[PDB]
Structures are given as structure tokens and as C-alpha cells.
């Protein structure tokens, strides 16, 4: 279980500029055409967002290169998944990713999202073993490719799928799915947006007015995480995993003032930073 397929490649993470991204709805009031100002943890504007090309299909002889090291969850993480077919899956948050520290584990299946704040034991390469069920010709997902045990659990939950991929377009799509993970005083707050991304893979200059999904009571201080990938068991190719190619973006949050221009429908359209530049 949980094949140790980390290949050899660290895959030096590239850098992109989050032009106007990472602006969630922070307030509990619906304001209309109100130029509010918020002292919350936002993704800085034009900040170095680490582009992590997760599954790196190499041009030599295929041999896709695995990724997703244990990225720090220092304060809050802006996660931007661009992948067309949902290779990306839930995440493995937690302080030690081991026992005695309940490692938050989100896992998205097509049916429903499963959130477990338990004491998991993640092995070297937590991934999703999407193997062929072979009964009724299905695609059963072995989840023990993520951890090795699941015990000492205090929170468990099942909700509607986080990663909804409505592809249906074949271009002008691969919806930029954005999630602000925010560990506010023992409360994992998740935000979201499905955006019809136009560009191939770069972050476009759109206003990601992230709407929050859930606020789950955790109590533990999450300091690391690592996304999970849906790997298909390959065949005798004239054990076997690494289907598809995976690339996403990771930015970090900072407690900096923002301006929030609400609309007549109470949506955020303009957002100017305060510690960015003199203007």
C-alpha cells in the first residue's frame, strides 16, 4: 500500500505572480456598493506564488515526475488547482502528519467530500490509489495509499464535493478552483471558487472573490500539508501509477489591510492593497 513513488525529482518549483487573486469574503454582513476595508489574512498582491508542477510528464520517454513535498502551512494557504481532470484531491494537513497530532485529512471522491480530523499515519507518499474495482467495471479508490492507520479521531464529516470539475468545454476551462485554507484559532475555514480560467495554465488577472464553504472546529495548530493526487494503476506497458499530468499553485497569506469594493449585488469587484505601493 502507498507505493513509494517519489521518483528522484524535487522539480524546482517555479514562480508566478498572483496579480489580483486571494480576496475572499471576510465579513458576515452583505454590503452593497460599500468601499469597506478589512484587516484580515489575505494573499499579497503580485506575490511570488510557488507554481508546483506536481506530475511532470517528461519529454524524453514519458516517465512523469512526482511532486508534492510537505509544504508549510505557516499561517494560511491559498491553493489554486488548475488541472482539467481532477487529479488533485483532498489534503493531508496536520502538525506532524502522524499520531498524537490529529492530521486533518480532506479527501474528495466523486460521490462526496470526506473530512476527517483523526490521528492518521501518513507514509512516505500519500496519494490516491484509484485502482480498477473490476467488479461492475468501476474505479475504486484505495485511500490507504494516503495513510497507514486512522485512529484517535475527534472530527468526522461528509459534505458535497469540493473539487467540482464541470469540464464540458475542452478549452477555456480547467476551472481554476481556488481554496483559502485558514486555521483561525482551532477552526479550519475553507473558501472556494470555480472559475472559467481562459489561459492555459497561468493565473489570469481576475478577481477571485472566494466564497467560504465550511468552518470546522479543529483545535490543533496545523503547520504543514500536502495535496493528494489521483493515480491510476497502469498496465503491462510494452507498482504502476502516475496517470495524467498535475500542476497547481501555492501562495501564502499575510495579515495586511485590503480595500473591498462591493457591488450593487454585494460582490467584490475592486480590491486594492494597502502595503503594496504608494498609490
Amino acid at each position, epitope marked *: 500500500q502507498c507505493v513509494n513513488l517519489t521518483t528522484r525529482t524535487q522539480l524546482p518549483p517555479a514562480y508566478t505572480n498572483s496579480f489580483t487573486r486571494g480576496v475572499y469574503y471576510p465579513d458576515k454582513v452583505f454590503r452593497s456598493s460599500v468601499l469597506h476595508s478589512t484587516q484580515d489574512l489575505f494573499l499579497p498582491f503580485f506575490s511570488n506564488v510557488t507554481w508546483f508542477h506536481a506530475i511532470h510528464v517528461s519529454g524524453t520517454n514519458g516517465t512523469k515526475r512526482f511532486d508534492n513535498p510537505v509544504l508549510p502551512f505557516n499561517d494560511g494557504v491559498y491553493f489554486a488547482s488548475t488541472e482539467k481532470s481532477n487529479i488533485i484531491r483532498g489534503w493531508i494537513f496536520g502538525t506532524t502528519l502522524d499520531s498524537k497530532t490529529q492530521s486533518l485529512l480532506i479527501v474528495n471522491n466523486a460521490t462526496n467530500v470526506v473530512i476527517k480530523v483523526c490521528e492518521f499515519q501518513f507514509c512516505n507518499d500519500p496519494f490516491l490509489g484509484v*485502482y*480498477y*474495482h*473490476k*467488479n*461492475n*467495471k468501476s474505479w*475504486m479508490e484505495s485511500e490507504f495509499r494516503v495513510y497507514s492507520s486512522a485512529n484517535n479521531c475527534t472530527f468526522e464529516y461528509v459534505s458535497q464535493p469540493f473539487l467540482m470539475d464541470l469540464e464540458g468545454k475542452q478549452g477555456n476551462f480547467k476551472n481554476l478552483r481556488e481554496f483559502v485554507f485558514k486555521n483561525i484559532d482551532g477552526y479550519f475555514k475553507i473558501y472556494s471558487k470555480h472559475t472559467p480560467i481562459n489561459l492555459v495554465r497561468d493565473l489570469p488577472q481576475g478577481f477571485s472573490a472566494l466564497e467560504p464553504l465550511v468552518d470546522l472546529p479543529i483545535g490543533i495548530n496545523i503547520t504543514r500539508f500536502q495535496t493528494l493526487l489521483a493515480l491510476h*494503476r497502469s*498496465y*503491462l506497458t510494452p*507498482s*504502476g501509477w502516475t496517470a495524467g499530468a498535475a500542476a497547481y499553485y501555492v501562495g501564502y497569506l499575510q495579515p495586511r489591510t485590503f480595500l473591498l469594493k462591493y457591488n450593487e449585488n454585494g460582490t467584490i469587484t475592486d480590491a486594492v492593497d494597502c502595503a503594496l505601493d504608494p498609490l
Partner: nanobody, 120 residues
Framework: EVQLLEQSGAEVKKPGASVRVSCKVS????????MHWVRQAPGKGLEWMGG????????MYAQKFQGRVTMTEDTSTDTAYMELSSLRSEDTAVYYC??????????????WGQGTLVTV
């Protein structure tokens, strides 16, 4: 890739009994590879039997050996039992376990477990 285990081992029985053949797997698990079986008598050819059907998702049985031979599968511990009954004279032979791809459309038995002789 895959390490196949022993199927039954050293099994010897006097006439008037019945024996199982529990094909074990490692590197893979049970409900991701289809099982198959081959009689191989000493100084004889091959005689296919058992089998899992890539079509129908059903676990086949040799039409010449229907009713006599059956099979069960335990997917967690990956034990594929093949039950013989109605022992006859020429029943003694090597009973090879083999496997085909999970999905469909495969005729080959690339991994096997060196078979098991029985006693009549």
C-alpha cells in the same frame, strides 16, 4: 512487478476426499487481477479450468468441469480458493494458478505460481 505466492503447496490425499487451492497474491491485490487455472498432468499438455471472465465480471469454470470444481475469493487476504470434489483416477495433476488483466481482453497468463500436484 508482481510476486505470486504458492497456491496450495504439498497436498496429498487418499481416494475419497476433497482439496482446496487458495491462490495467494502479492504486489497486487485480489479484485484487481482475474484468476485462471490450468491442469497439467505429468507427461501431458495443458487443460484450462476455473478462470475469471473479463466479460460479465464472472468467475469462469471449465465447461468440461462444471459443477465439480468451484471457487471463492477473499479480497482482503487475497485468497482465491479452488475446490475440487468427486475424485477420480486421472485427477492427479499439477493445478496451476494464473491471472489475466483486471479490465478485459486478455488471453495470457504471464504470472503463475508453479502449480500444485494432487493425489488420487
Amino acid at each position: 512487478e508482481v510476486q505470486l505466492l504458492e497456491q496450495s503447496g504439498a497436498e496429498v490425499k487418499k481416494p475419497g476426499a476433497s482439496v482446496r487451492v487458495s491462490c495467494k497474491v502479492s504486489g497486487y491485490t485480489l479484485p484487481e487481477v482475474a484468476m485462471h487455472w490450468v491442469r497439467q498432468a505429468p507427461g501431458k499438455g495443458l487443460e484450462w479450468m476455473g478462470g475469471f471472465d473479463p466479460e460479465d465480471g464472472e468467475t469462469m469454470y471449465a465447461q468440461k468441469f462444471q459443477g465439480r470444481v468451484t471457487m471463492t475469493e477473499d479480497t482482503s487476504t487475497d485468497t482465491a480458493y479452488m475446490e475440487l470434489s468427486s475424485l477420480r483416477s486421472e485427477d492427479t495433476a499439477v493445478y496451476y494458478c494464473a491471472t489475466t488483466t483486471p479490465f478485459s481482453s486478455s488471453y495470457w497468463f504471464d504470472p503463475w505460481g508453479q502449480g500444485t500436484l494432487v493425489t488420487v
